[PDB]
Design a protein around this ligand. Structure first.
Ligand SMILES: CCCCCCCC/C=C\CCCCCCCC(=O)OC[C@H](O)CO
Ligand SMILES: CCCCCCCC/C=C\CCCCCCCC(=O)OC[C@H](O)CO
Ligand SMILES: CCCCCCCC/C=C\CCCCCCCC(=O)OC[C@H](O)CO
Ligand SMILES: CCCCCCCC/C=C\CCCCCCCC(=O)OC[C@H](O)CO
Ligand SMILES: CCCCCCCC/C=C\CCCCCCCC(=O)OC[C@H](O)CO
Ligand SMILES: CCCCCCCC/C=C\CCCCCCCC(=O)OC[C@H](O)CO
Ligand SMILES: CCCCCCCC/C=C\CCCCCCCC(=O)OC[C@H](O)CO
Ligand SMILES: CCCCCCCC/C=C\CCCCCCCC(=O)OC[C@H](O)CO
Ligand SMILES: CCCCCCCC/C=C\CCCCCCCC(=O)OC[C@H](O)CO
Ligand SMILES: CCCCCCCC/C=C\CCCCCCCC(=O)OC[C@H](O)CO
Ligand SMILES: CCCCCCCC/C=C\CCCCCCCC(=O)OC[C@H](O)CO
Ligand SMILES: CCCCCCCC/C=C\CCCCCCCC(=O)OC[C@H](O)CO
Ligand SMILES: *C/C=C(C)/C=C/C=C(C)/C=C/C1=C(C)CCCC1(C)C
Ligand SMILES: *C/C=C(C)/C=C/C=C(C)/C=C/C1=C(C)CCCC1(C)C
Ligand SMILES: *C/C=C(C)/C=C/C=C(C)/C=C/C1=C(C)CCCC1(C)C
Ligand SMILES: *C/C=C(C)/C=C/C=C(C)/C=C/C1=C(C)CCCC1(C)C
Ligand SMILES: *C/C=C(C)/C=C/C=C(C)/C=C/C1=C(C)CCCC1(C)C
Ligand SMILES: CCCCCCCCCCCCCCCCCCCC
Ligand SMILES: CCCCCCCCCCCCCCCCCCCC
Ligand SMILES: CCCCCCCCCCCCCCCCCCCC
Ligand SMILES: CCCCCCCCCCCCCCCCCCCC
Ligand SMILES: CCCCCCCCCCCCCCCCCCCC
Ligand SMILES: CCCCCCCCCCCCCCCCCCCC
Ligand SMILES: CCCCCCCCO[C@@H]1O[C@H](CO)[C@@H](O)[C@H](O)[C@H]1O
Ligand SMILES: CCCCCCCCO[C@@H]1O[C@H](CO)[C@@H](O)[C@H](O)[C@H]1O
Ligand SMILES: CCCCCCCCO[C@@H]1O[C@H](CO)[C@@H](O)[C@H](O)[C@H]1O
Ligand SMILES: CCCCCCCCO[C@@H]1O[C@H](CO)[C@@H](O)[C@H](O)[C@H]1O
Ligand SMILES: CCCCCCCCO[C@@H]1O[C@H](CO)[C@@H](O)[C@H](O)[C@H]1O
Ligand code: NA
Ligand code: NA
Ligand code: NA
Ligand code: NA
Ligand code: NA
Lengths: 273, 273, 273, 273, 273
């Protein structure tokens, strides 16, 4: 069957199909995904006034990100269930092309909201020392955009052209490393002149940021992480990818947002944790 | 017809089918489910300022849980009606696999929000005495997650492998008992140093918590509670399961949330009740 | 064909079909239904601060009821259009079972929100004299639930078993009379020690309550109110039922809520109308 | 084909079909419709505190009307696209009865919200002199309802029975004239003893009211305004009808609401325009 | 296949079909579109109180525009996926007419909100010097409407009648140039008597306005910008058009709104940036 430049889910779906567990789990984890985001939207709105005025833009940007992530994860949940249909005879879910091919690209372009806003929002909580606000913001946003767009092109080829997949991935990675570099700088300057309590939180934020963001290129590579005809080039790999996205999404957006809120409280003149 | 690792609803649906009453009731009770949750969302938002600032996080977390539960119960309501279709010739609803198999697993993974947040939220109303806040929270969250994940694996096998069903269920149960243990401690420490009115409420909360949470493993076992080829391995058991979920959901989320709100009022310096 | 324990709409739909007017009107009146409820939701939220704090729970409970009623009436609007499909050859809408049978039972189980909350909410406006708050509430809620549950069982049989229909209906009626009894008591005690203006409103509330609530058993019986093979056992009776529900819904929920709000204003120490 | 008592859209749709332009425009204009209403909902909520408390009920009722109109226009937009399907062979959209016949009656019954509330809401801005508040309200509401109900019956016959169409239309018209009469009285009494600024606005409101409300019987007659086999008994007439509704809807609801808000500001003791 | 007065997307879709990348990208970019708008809605509401009262109408009108754009872009996202269906045999998406033809006309009529409101809203932030507020508003609104309506007629013919396409486009362009003229005047008068910081922002607003608004006629012409049978009369041109719309939409609505908000802050007597 002729699929072209399509994600590997569609190939598994079209040949082997998915077991009840594989299909249902993938559905469940996406559903949990979008549920978490809408719950988070409510949380961040409802807690705006828990911090001093100057910090409240962080709450607002969290909320912005929640909207994006909800809409996407919801749309993608539906895309999953439309793309694969139960076959009675064998008792597995197979590619139903009338529902469109499944594509992870939805996530990527929506990152053009999430990434810039997540990177931006810390700059409303921490004070920089030697770095300039506008400079950091511009570096974040440029490298963010390039990271995403290059990756986005990559993933179309994850089956059809493994070379293009890896080369685009590599280029993307370069921009990723730049972001890591700049964020580390920000975190360090953030720590300067604040309580030990706030410094502990920023330490935690950095570890959360580093792990959670790294999951995303993890999900990129997922089908191939056990090499050719490996364990992960299978319904098991499909499950793994969406699990990793969901963990990454919750970590990088919600928990990140919560920790920033907690930092904002410690830095607030009225309030205490 | 090969169904595999699927819930028992699909087996009843595929062999006997469901009567008008069985199909419609199941539909109605899920609808009532999600209606209750959205109504609850409104209630908890609209009553935030009925309690002192420090208590208001309980209202917010109630609201968070309402969002999760609404989304899930709504999604599951639709799943029910898509999965079973009327057959004119016999006048019963039968498995329609084009709608996907029905699976209760949606609930389980969404509990990864509900359970942690419900356990968490009491710690914003009551003061601990001998226990440490972070300790209780960590025990709740770890045991919560393990309870859910093990159960989630179990339920896939409730027909296909009765042994796996029961063993996973048993392991889950161990974690459940731990939670019960910790919550009892919390309730007792909560009672110390507060009005008799607030103590009465916490007494009620404990009974509500104990019954409502125990319904959930009840629903797990439901098809087998009258043994093999029992009364409950039938459309009657299908109805019963979703009824029990809905009672449990309303009790454990809404009423629980309401009682905590009432406790918060009694502990509030301004307010009376 | 074999329909079983199904509402009479499905029997009309399956034999005679519905005319354009009958089908469209039923659709229109349900649509108006849910529109009214969402508009009411807005009204009750937006007018919360028009009354003293102590009265504001009445506004909140109105809002709660609006959410329930919206969701249900919306869902039921869609159920109507899915259940009956145009036949080109004869030019009438006939039962389309692929859409599920139509069932009024959706309403009934959602009353488990509406009824308790509507009865409850007056107790936040009026002061009782000789009666106890918790006593009245418990009687309302118990008799409410029994009324609904017994009726709910009844209506499944409105075609399939006329005896069961009437017996369950009769039992339901007993609990209805109890509620009427208790509400009358409440209204009388409410009138004691308040302005003539507030007393006039409570007089109006009682008449509204009595008529509007009585429409509901009216809708129950509707197909049979002109006896066997009567005028109303027809598409005309189908129309009539849903019209009566919608009148009853608007009266018993919205207008009731509005009048209570007006009462709350007169009893409010700052406020004037 | 046998269509029965159906709107003329369905007859054009069933015989000639609709061109790309006719089908798409009708779709676009309904979409614009419901978009305007939801935008208006936001506007009216967000501007509540721009006027003195006593005037704020006008904002609230505007908002109520917006909800109704949104829901309806949205529902009707979907009805349009479901009712007419592209035929490849000829390249026109034809009646698809599996989607139900299109009916304008949805609008009419929703007017049972819109009309009463629009007429009501002015009575919260202007002061009457010689007329009684409750008297005007009752006349508005009675004549409103009769206007709508009679018209609603009429439009079912606009093809099937031209006599009934015109007679019901005529009766409706009588009630319309009564409303015009009463509104003129209200406007004049409104003008008495208020600033020149407020008087100018009421002058504008009257012209807006008169034109916008008259469009609605215009849309009623639309197919026949060029007589038999005229220009307008065609896809061109279908387009025209929905355009006129949309102009009327925006004028009679949104702009009307805006002008009243502006009047409320001029009459407000705190505020300036 | 007879398509008639239809957009060129449908012709590409009906002959060549779309590759995975072309179909998916178009879907992704529209999704990002509507996501951005809903996020923007939240932002503009949540930041109303960040500026002095007099400026807050700009926030409200931003919000209004967000609602319109969300609804449209959402609706259009769905229209895309309904209009083109995967063909298994060749592995390309082809026109599926059961989903309706795709038409960009949805956008145009919704501009009847967006354009007037965007032009209007600046007049609440800047002070005019030479010009009259009502005069500028009327010129904006008249020329806006004429621009849109003429363009709207044009685009129906972009394939079927290239002459009509270009003539209507030309007429539209005339009105566009008028708007540019008036806006330039506004921006210059805005700069007079305000801080250098606010002047820099208005400089930026002008460049943003000029580029972003010019993209829209760009998208109009897109298929023909490489002449006959050029690179862009292809799936590549389809992609390009929707990319350009989305860039234009984000720029002209969100970023424009953000910059105005920033200007409002600098002009605010309480607040600083
Ligand atoms: C700029 C980066 C472009 C990379 C293109 C690419 O990797 O192409 C691989 C080649 O087609 C393998 O056969
Ligand atoms: C089936 C069961 C129906 C569930 C009932 C309501 C669901 C909506 C939640 C609304 C909860 C209202 C509770 C309430 O009114 O309590 C007031 C409180 O005692 C003073 O603060
Ligand atoms: C704390 C972490 C739990 C770790 C392992 C649990 C292992 C439980 C797995 C039980 C599987 C039982 C089974 O597979 O049944 C054997 C046979 O098929 C029946 O007939
Ligand atoms: C980490 C998730 C581990 C998933 C573990 C899945 C175990 C499933 C199981 O217990 O096996 C039952 C089956 O019937 C025997 O073949
Ligand atoms: C309520 C659920 C508990 C068990 C349900 C009670 C048994 C079903 C009630 C019933 O009406 O039985 C007839 C059959 O289920 C249909 O025709
Ligand atoms: C739980 C309540 C169980 C309710 C049991 C349902 C009773 C069914 C009934 O009343 O119907 C009798 C007759 O068999 C109909 O044809
Ligand atoms: C408890 C009341 C239960 C009432 C149930 C009535 C059952 C009944 O009337 O059965 C009729 C019989 O099946 C022949 O018509
Ligand atoms: C005043 C309110 C209602 C008027 C009641 C009178 C209703 C008269 C309706 C006339 C009618 O229905 O017309 C019959 C038709 O012309 C046959 O060809
Ligand atoms: C409510 C009364 C319904 C009025 C409908 C009567 C009517 O006007 O029908 C036209 C004609 O007489 C029938 O073919
Ligand atoms: C193409 C893809 C790009 C899509 C990205 C747009 C994100 C969408 C909505 C967020 C709302 C905008 C939030 C911008 C914040 C700017 C800001 O806050 O700066 C001024 C501040 O308020 C000083 O007090
Ligand atoms: C002013 C309205 C005038 C605009 C009408 C233009 C129509 C047109 O350009 O027609 C071309 C001709 O039909 C090609 O064969
Ligand atoms: C190919 C394009 C890729 C698209 C993705 C690129 C990232 C852009 C993200 C958001 C822009 C939102 C617009 C906000 C513009 C104003 C920012 C600003 O004013 O700066 C903050 C201010 O200094 C503090 O007060
Ligand atoms: C909320 C969403 C977030 C934080 C997304 C982050 C995405 C990345 C860090 C993506 C990184 C990638 C690489 C570094 C290589 C492969 C391509 C990407 C874009 C997945
Ligand atoms: C709002 C949802 C709640 C409170 C869910 C609670 C779920 C449980 C207490 C589940 C318990 C289970 C067992 C103890 C055994 C079987 C597996 C579970 C997960 C159903
Ligand atoms: C908002 C919904 C309300 C107020 C519903 C009220 C329902 C009733 C009063 C139902 C009464 C019934 C009887 C007394 C006999 C037949 C069975 C019932 C439940 C319809
Ligand atoms: C927001 C909706 C409004 C203001 C609707 C107004 C409707 C009318 C004024 C209808 C008038 C009619 C006639 C006077 C004759 C034909 C039947 C009607 C109902 C369309
Ligand atoms: C938010 C939407 C906006 C700002 C839309 C702006 C639209 C235009 C500036 C359209 C311009 C056109 C021309 C000048 C020629 C072709 C026809 C139009 C309407 C696309
Ligand atoms: C399915 C029935 C389960 C009900 C359990 C009742 C809870 C008892 C614990 C106290
Ligand atoms: C049988 C249905 C049970 C209805 C429950 C209402 C009982 C009242 C208990 C309220 C205690 C606060
Ligand atoms: C439809 C008009 C109302 C009919 C009255 C029948 C009500 C019976 C109530 C029994 C209690
Ligand atoms: C045909 C398009 C009509 C545009 C209406 C958009 C809906 C929102 C209404 C906002 C009205 C703005 C007027 C503000 C001026 C008051 C001072
Ligand atoms: C306290 C407020 C009092 C409101 C009284 C206003 C009454 C308006 C209700 C309208 C009822 C119209 C009844 C029409 C009957 C159907 C006849 C249609 C002709 C065939
Ligand atoms: C100053 C005006 C510059 C605006 C640029 C507009 C270009 C639009 C053409 C579309 C982009 C090319 C795509 C092939
Ligand atoms: C950095 C990690 C990248 C590892 C690249 C390994 C490439 C795997 O090789 C690929 O495996 C597929 C699935 O088994 C096969 O279907 C393909 O034919 C094969 O090219
Ligand atoms: C604590 C409750 C667990 C008891 C397990 C009950 C054993 C059920 O046994 C099962 O019953 C099914 C339905 O009757 C049969 O179809 C299966 O063959 C049988 O394995
Ligand atoms: C108290 C109100 C209840 C009145 C009961 C009336 C009995 C109706 O009798 C029923 O009428 C149906 C409709 O034609 C027939 O199809 C049934 O066979 C018949 O039993
Ligand atoms: C303006 C209000 C009165 C208008 C009445 C016009 C009479 C229309 O007459 C009708 O025209 C239809 C369309 O051409 C024909 O198909 C019908 O046969 C004819 O009865
Ligand atoms: C200002 C830019 C306008 C240039 C318009 C000239 C291009 C018109 O060229 C058109 O190309 C189409 C596909 O490429 C063909 O199908 C048409 O037959 C042809 O007229
Ligand atoms: Na599926
Ligand atoms: Na079904
Ligand atoms: Na239908
Ligand atoms: Na269509
Ligand atoms: Na598609």
């Amino acid at each position: 069957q002729e699929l072209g430049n399509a994600n590997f889910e569609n190939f598994i779906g079209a040949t082997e199909g998915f077991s009840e567990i594989a299909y249902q789990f993938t559905s469940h984890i996406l559903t949990l995904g979008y549920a978490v985001m809408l719950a988070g939207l409510l949380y961040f709105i409802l807690t705006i006034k828990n911090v001093d005025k100057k910090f409240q833009m962080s709450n607002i940007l969290s909320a912005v990100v929640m909207v994006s992530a909800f809409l996407l994860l919801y749309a993608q949940a539906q895309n999953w269930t439309s793309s694969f249909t139960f076959n009675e005879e064998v008792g597995r879910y197979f590619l139903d092309p009338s529902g469109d091919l499944f594509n992870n690209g939805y996530r990527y372009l929506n990152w053009l909201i999430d990434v810039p806003m997540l990177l931006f929002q810390i700059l409303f909580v921490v004070s920089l020392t030697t770095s300039k606000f506008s400079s950091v913001r511009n570096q974040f946003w440029f490298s963010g955009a390039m990271m995403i767009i290059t990756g986005y092109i990559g993933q179309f080829y994850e089956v059809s052209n493994l070379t293009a997949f890896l080369v685009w991935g590599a280029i993307s990675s370069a921009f990723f490393f730049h972001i890591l570099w700049v964020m580390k700088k920000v975190i360090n300057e953030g720590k300067e002149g604040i309580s030990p309590a706030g410094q502990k939180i920023l330490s935690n934020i950095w570890i959360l940021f580093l792990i959670s963001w790294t999951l995303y290129p993890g999900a990129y590579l997922m089908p191939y992480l056990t090499g050719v005809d490996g364990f992960l080039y299978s319904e098991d790999g499909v499950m793994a990818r969406q699990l990793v996205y969901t963990i990454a999404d919750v970590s990088s957006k919600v928990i990140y947002g919560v920790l920033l809120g907690n930092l904002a409280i410690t830095l607030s003149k009225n309030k205490e944790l």
